[PDB]
Amino acid sequence: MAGAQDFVPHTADLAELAAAAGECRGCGLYRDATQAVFGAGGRSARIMMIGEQPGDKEDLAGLPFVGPAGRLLDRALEAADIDRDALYVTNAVKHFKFTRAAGGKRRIKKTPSRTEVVACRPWLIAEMTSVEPDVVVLLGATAAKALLGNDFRVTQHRGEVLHVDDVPGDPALVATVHPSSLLRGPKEERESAFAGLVDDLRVAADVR
Ligand code: SF4
């Protein structure tokens, strides 16, 4: 078998899937991470949101989007009039890939290789088959490329509703900036970028 496929059980039950992901060895990232971080939410969710990976806070909370980027995402969701409890939120890879620097105040995320993304993608497929979302919001380059192709450029398709043929259930896809990118930079640029994230979330939420 390839990647995580043999570790994925034949079930759409999210609790069963999350327990199975705790035992995944589909790539190397399970070794140094604290635990797998599966998606959070229920199968009635109409909107699925996919980030890159659990970060330092998520790796220990056991839940996605709990750190500063998650708090910015909550502020954007509220501004977009979307209830976070109604979404299903997850990440392209389920184990935190990291390093430390001497004197650092946190573990530093490292970018998943395309190999790791493809290895973990069976979990993402299981999640999408389980949830059957009407729309998938892809937060950042890694997540967007996971579904849209390794050459895809988030920066070139902002605001656009995409549909690709190899995605199960043919949901609408909206690729946007990852909330972590909005945490730093000059104020005017951060404020414009925040408005653009709210716009993209509203596009996704307006999908019938
Ligand atoms: S990152 Fe994904 S494929 Fe790799 S070990 Fe973790 S759950 Fe399995």
Residue numbers in the entry: 1 to 208
Copy text from the publication:
UdgX excises uracil from uracil-containing DNA to concurrently form a covalent bond with the resulting AP-DNA. Structurally, UdgX is highly similar to family-4 UDGs (F4-UDGs). Our earlier studies allowed us to propose a reaction mechanism of UdgX, which involves the formation of a covalent bond between H109 of UdgX with the C1′ position of the target deoxyribose sugar concurrently with the uracil excision from this site in DNA.
Substitutions of His109 in MsmUdgX with Ser, Gly, Ala, Gln, Cys and Lys showed the loss of its covalent complex formation with DNA but gained canonical UDG activities. In the reactions of the mutant proteins with ssU9, the entire substrate was converted to product by the H109G mutant, while hardly any substrate was utilized by the H109K mutant. Further, the overlay of all the structures of UdgX H109 mutants showed that the overall structures are very well conserved with a Cα RMSD of ca 0.2 Å. As anticipated, we note a clear difference in the sizes of the active site cavities in the various mutants. It suggested that the initial increase in UDG activity (H109K to H109Q to H109G) occurred because of the efficiency with which the water molecule could be localized to make a nucleophilic attack on the C1′ position.
